[PDB]
Amino acid sequence: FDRTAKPVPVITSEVTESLEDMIRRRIQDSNFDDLQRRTL
């Protein structure tokens, strides 16, 4: 049969390795979004 909504994704080792590798890339680049202080 058919379903009606997105199934909640189970966390596995592969996706958490991909995610920590993404964070590794972000930190190594030191390019990440922050709320920088307003000037003037």
Binding site: T4, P9, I27
Partner: protein, 256 residues
């Protein structure tokens, strides 16, 4: 003062309508912007000027597991205070928070000890986002591992694309603290993978060669399902975005 709140919510409705019309006008003018060759309104008035303060509060007569989770969210955020609602009505609650002067509210709901809902409200007649949070794992659930470092944290946002993603990243960004240090130690990550955003705390040191992170904090996937214009007292304010479940493309549509 009630007349003040009524007048200000009416002006806020008009300002949001004007911003919608001007954003459609900007989408029209973008085609010209590629021929020759920014934050929200409330978070613009208080973008980096004042630092925010949040009140994280339980639902009502909460269990010990929910209270532990509320304490965990309080430790995740900086400038948070934990609040135990017992016999506070919702109008008096948001009235006391407005009167005290509080940037935002985070109220939690659970099911038999398992947290499942989290609603955030910006307080000067700001928007309320209702998330459903599913896959909760707490520090209390893991182990005695020490304590959160509580330093002003860095932020990371992955795969936020549409205007809804911009709204959400602006809301969460201004829940966090403004102007962190360069060598700030803990970084909060907000990953987006098909409408199921996931948050993690991570400390990192730069090695002799690269970076090495340790995962700490809570661990849970949340997913937005409402964004109301007024504060959460109303339950009659206009809806800016509403998750549609019984539509045909419900299991295929992303950011909806």
């Amino acid at each position: 003062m009630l007349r003040r709140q009524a007048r200000e919510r009416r002006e806020y409705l008009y300002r949001k309508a004007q911003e919608l019309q001007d954003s459609q006008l900007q989408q029209k003018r973008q085609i010209i912007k590629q021929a020759l060759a920014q934050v929200d309104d409330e978070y613009a008035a208080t973008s980096g000027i004042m630092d925010p303060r949040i009140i994280v509060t339980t639902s009502r007569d909460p269990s010990t597991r929910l209270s532990q989770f509320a304490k965990e969210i309080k430790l995740l955020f900086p400038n948070a205070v934990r609040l135990n609602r017992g016999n506070y009505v919702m109008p008096n609650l948001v009235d006391a928070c407005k009167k005290s002067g509080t940037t935002d509210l985070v109220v939690l709901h659970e099911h038999r000890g398992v947290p499942t809902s989290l609603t955030i409200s910006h307080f000067p007649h700001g928007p309320t986002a209702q998330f459903s949070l599913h896959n909760v794992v707490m520090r209390h659930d893991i182990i005695n591992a020490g304590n959160q470092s509580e330093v002003n944290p860095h932020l990371i946002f992955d795969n936020f694309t549409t205007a809804l993603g911009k709204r959400v990243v602006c809301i969460l960004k201004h829940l966090f603290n403004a102007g962190p240090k360069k060598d700030s130690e803990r970084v909060i990550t907000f990953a987006n993978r098909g409408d199921f955003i996931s948050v993690r705390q991570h400390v990192y040191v730069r090695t002799r060669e690269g970076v090495e992170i340790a995962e700490v904090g809570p661990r849970f996937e949340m997913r937005l399902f409402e964004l109301r214009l007024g504060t959460l007292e109303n339950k009659d304010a206009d809806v800016e975005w509403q998750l549609r479940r019984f539509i045909r493309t419900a299991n295929k549509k992303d950011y909806l």
